[PDB]
């Protein structure tokens, strides 16, 4: 604190965020979503063009947050060594929370499977329910996820050795290789002979393998936003927290899928 | 039995299990009273001696002998309490030969009783249903919100096993004096047991919420002798 002209710059390495309007707007959009979804399901509205507007507004609000979160690290230049550690801790404590919503659904699968009720004839996948064969498309999904887990490491080892063509191609292949998972699992939902209301088996299978779908649309969006931010020269060879944050989300979903394939598709 | 106006304590017991519950409660209250009196006396001492005092003892903050004496003593109390609790939990139950079975189905806002024995070859099984008497139709001397039109009747000095199920929602079978509080789920059968030592009338009420008329679903159990049970069973 004895450098010559030190009072002209801050004396602590933390970010003082400027005033922003987004927290209020997201809350106002979520209020509309909640009320319109609670009413539309029981009459009172009729037209289905209000719920869509509410969802679109919520998503646009999140995107307008992330714009301001990107202009404060790449252009203004306020992300010191402390702020990056804080952001990493934050993301870890959200991944941890999103992992504990799957534990509940697994405990709702082991609580019915072990001890099947009198009503259903005592049997898993019960009489009249032909399960999904695990030597078909749900193997291509596992292999594509394992390949995706390896192709993004060739993208993070080409940005530290200063190769550009080799960090764009890896991200392209990863994005074009998580789309095939969604395509395969949207074609296995149209070749099935049991819906969400035919059993307790068709209601827990479509409720632990359907949230994964929503979580993997997010990775497609995140990888697009990381390809488009590398084409425009936004990443240095040692300051890239969008890649590190995205790679800890892909590996977690791969580990979760390896638990939705031996407990839902083999075990029966 | 019947509640008393300014009640302070349990209703009168008529089955061994309620007697055991009372004994265990009076066993725990000993230690609870000791601890409460100790804390009250220490607060009295602090208020009487150390109120607006000139001298402040600001260097007694560590403790080593005393910190082990409020960490080991409470554990001993808990073990002493836990011995009789496990003894009662594992001991008191229907170890041998239940003698009668009464199936109690709890519909929305009344009760349905069946005696699983006494069956003829054609399915002539004795069955009846219990409603609550409205306040407009009560006779002189009946209890309001506890008297019913049909009441369960059982012999004295006989093991009775209740099987409880439900048809609409989650109800709960309760007879305080008899020591019976079991649940009634829509797809499982629960069971309890009771032995009655003296004749009389035992009143009870529902526990788990079921809707609008949750306060009108009484239970009434009579304990007649064997001759009166035989005479009553040959009329229904």
């Amino acid at each position: 604190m004895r450098i010559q002209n030190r009072e002209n710059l801050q004396l602590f390495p933390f970010h003082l965020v400027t005033n922003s309007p987004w927290p209020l707007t997201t809350s106002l959009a979520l209020m509309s979503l909640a009320l319109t979804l609670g009413l539309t399901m029981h009459g009172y509205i009729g037209n289905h063009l209000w719920l869509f507007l509410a969802i679109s507004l919520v998503l646009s609000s999140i995107f307008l947050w992330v714009r301001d979160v990107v202009i404060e690290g790449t252009y203004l230049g306020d992300h010191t060594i402390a702020v990056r550690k804080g952001l990493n801790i934050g993301f870890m404590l959200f991944v941890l929370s999103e992992i504990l919503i799957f534990a509940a659904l697994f405990w709702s699968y082991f609580h019915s499977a072990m001890g099947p009720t009198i009503e259903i004839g005592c049997q898993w996948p019960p009489v009249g329910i032909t399960s999904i064969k695990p030597t078909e498309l749900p193997l291509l999904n596992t292999i594509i996820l394992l390949a995706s887990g390896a192709t993004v490491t060739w993208a993070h080892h080409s940005i530290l050795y200063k190769d550009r063509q080799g960090t764009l191609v890896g991200l392209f292949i990863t994005t074009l290789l998580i789309i095939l998972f969604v395509g395969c699992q949207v074609l296995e939902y149209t070749w099935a002979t049991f819906t969400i209301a035919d059993s307790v088996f068709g209601s827990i299978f479509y409720a632990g393998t359907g949230l994964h779908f929503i979580h993997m649309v997010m990775l497609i969006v995140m990888l697009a936003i990381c390809y488009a931010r590398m084409y425009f020269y936004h990443f240095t060879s040692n300051h890239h927290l969008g890649l590190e944050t995205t790679i800890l989300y892909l590996h977690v979903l791969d580990i979760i899928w390896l638990f939705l394939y031996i407990v839902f598709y083999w075990w029966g | 039995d019947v509640p008393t106006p300014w009640g302070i304590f349990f209703q009168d017991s008529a089955t061994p299990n309620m007697e055991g519950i009372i004994e265990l409660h009076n066993n725990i209250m000993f230690y609870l009273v000791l601890i409460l009196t100790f804390v009250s006396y220490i607060l009295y001492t602090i208020i009487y001696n150390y109120s607006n005092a000139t001298i402040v003892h600001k260097y007694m903050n560590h403790g080593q002998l005393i910190e082990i004496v409020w960490t080991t003593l409470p554990a001993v109390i808990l073990l002493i309490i836990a011995f009789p609790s496990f003894i009662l939990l594992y001991l008191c139950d229907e170890v041998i030969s239940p003698a009668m079975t009464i199936k109690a189905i709890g519909l929305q806002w009344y009760w349905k009783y069946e005696y699983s024995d006494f069956i003829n070859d054609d399915g002539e099984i004795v069955e009846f249903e219990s409603y609550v008497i409205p306040e407009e139709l009560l006779e002189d001397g009946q209890l309001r919100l506890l008297d019913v039109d049909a009441s369960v009747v059982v012999p004295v000095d006989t093991h009775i096993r209740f099987i409880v199920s439900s048809a609409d929602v989650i109800h709960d079978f309760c007879v305080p004096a008899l020591g019976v509080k079991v649940d009634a789920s829509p797809g499982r059968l629960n069971q309890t047991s009771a032995l009655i030592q003296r004749e009389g009338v035992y009143y009870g009420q529902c526990s788990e919420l079921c809707g609008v008329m949750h306060s009108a679903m009484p239970i009434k159990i009579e304990a007649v002798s064997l001759y009166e049970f035989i005479n009553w069973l040959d009329e229904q």
Binding site: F110, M114, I262, V263, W266, W267, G268 | -
Partner: protein, 374 residues
């Protein structure tokens, strides 16, 4: 009958807790490849020597007497830990603990097999039984370190002795080892069991799983103060989760496939271990290794009894003694040989060789899909 499983769970938990509480305290006596190796080897070798004798004696006398004897030996071992102030005396206390651990494990597994006759129930109960080892190894070191730093030495051993006394009171009030009951008929000799190959592959699957672990902890760079408490935490959680999941899933999936996948995961994790060059990098592999080991237990342990009920006479004790010998065969040989190989070739080379062997042995477990009936 569930009280029986609770008794076995308590015995295993207390044994592993008394085995693992020391590592908070070992730096004080020690002050590391060669010195700490004897502490590891002393318990394992004594256990290995004593397993077969207990396996033979269980037919003549029965289960509860060996269980209570293991109890008394464990209590004496805890008291001997309490009053020790030299490096040499620690080895004697370790060796005394070994016999009790061996007796408790063999008798508990054999008795759980005997009481529970159905296959699926046997697997489901043995998974929960094996979970106690992971739980105790999880619970030990933090407990020891906290009491060592706060109350001082000789306090943790007294607390653990109090817990042991509670366990013994429970055992007396439940099993009541008051009479001697020989078994219905004598079992096949250990030589005949050694002749049978499938039991040999079953034992080898357990034996080869623990080499990557047993070679590693003696050489960890931990021998600050907080590091000792958390050093062994991840593997315990992984083993717990793996045992609990696969004890239920093994029967429906197929035990051979579960064993194959577990051994492959063991090999992959061991191969991934030596890439890391910092201490924190050792966090990630350990989970996987622990998890894989759990699978290889929960699927391979019950099948032993199945083989006994499919090609020999239904007398337990000796076969589960064979399983325990296979379990302990890695901690007796590791520290006394690996360092030599560490001098001979290297540490990462040894780890890579062990991982390659683990991956190679995986196909041999396909032979257990269906064995010929007797």
């Amino acid at each position: 009958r569930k009280l029986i499983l609770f008794i076995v769970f308590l015995a295993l938990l207390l044994d592993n807790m008394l085995l693992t509480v020391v590592v908070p305290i070992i730096p004080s006596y020690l002050y590391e490849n060669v010195q700490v190796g004897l502490l590891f080897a002393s318990k394992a070798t004594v256990q290995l020597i004593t397993n077969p004798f207990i396996g033979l004696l269980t037919n003549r006398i029965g289960y509860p007497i060996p269980i209570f004897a293991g109890f008394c030996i464990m209590f004496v071992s805890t008291i001997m830990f309490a009053f020790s102030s030299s490096y040499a005396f620690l080895l004697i206390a370790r060796s005394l603990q070994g016999i009790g651990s061996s007796c408790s494990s063999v008798a508990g597994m054999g008795m759980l097999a005997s009481v529970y006759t159905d296959d699926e129930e046997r697997g489901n109960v043995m998974g929960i039984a094996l979970g106690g080892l992971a739980m105790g190894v999880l619970v030990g070191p933090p407990f020891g370190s906290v009491l060592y730093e706060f109350v001082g030495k000789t306090a943790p051993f007294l607390v653990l002795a109090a817990l042991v006394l509670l366990d013994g009171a429970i055992q007396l009030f439940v099993l009541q080892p008051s009479r001697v009951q020989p078994e219905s008929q004598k079992g096949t000799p250990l030589t005949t069991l050694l002749k049978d190959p499938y039991i040999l592959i079953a034992a080898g699957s357990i034996c080869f799983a623990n080499m990557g672990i047993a070679m590693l902890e003696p050489a960890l760079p931990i021998w600050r103060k907080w590091q000792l408490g958390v050093a062994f935490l991840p593997a315990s959680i992984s083993y717990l989760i793996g045992t609990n999941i696969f004890g239920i899933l093994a029967h429906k999936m197929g035990r051979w496939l579960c064993a194959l996948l577990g051994m492959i995961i063991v090999g992959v994790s061991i191969l991934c271990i030596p890439f890391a060059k910092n201490i924190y990098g050792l966090i990630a592999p350990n989970f996987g290794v622990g998890f894989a080991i759990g699978m290889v237990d929960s699927s391979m342990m019950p099948i032993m009894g199945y083989l006994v009920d499919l090609r020999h006479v239904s007398v337990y004790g000796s076969v589960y003694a064979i399983a325990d010998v296979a379990f302990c065969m890695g901690y007796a040989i590791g520290p006394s040989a690996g360092g030599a190989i560490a001098k001979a070739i290297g540490f990462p080379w040894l780890m890579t060789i062990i991982g390659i062997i683990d991956i190679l042995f995986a196909p041999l477990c396909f032979f257990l899909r269906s064995p010929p009936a007797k």
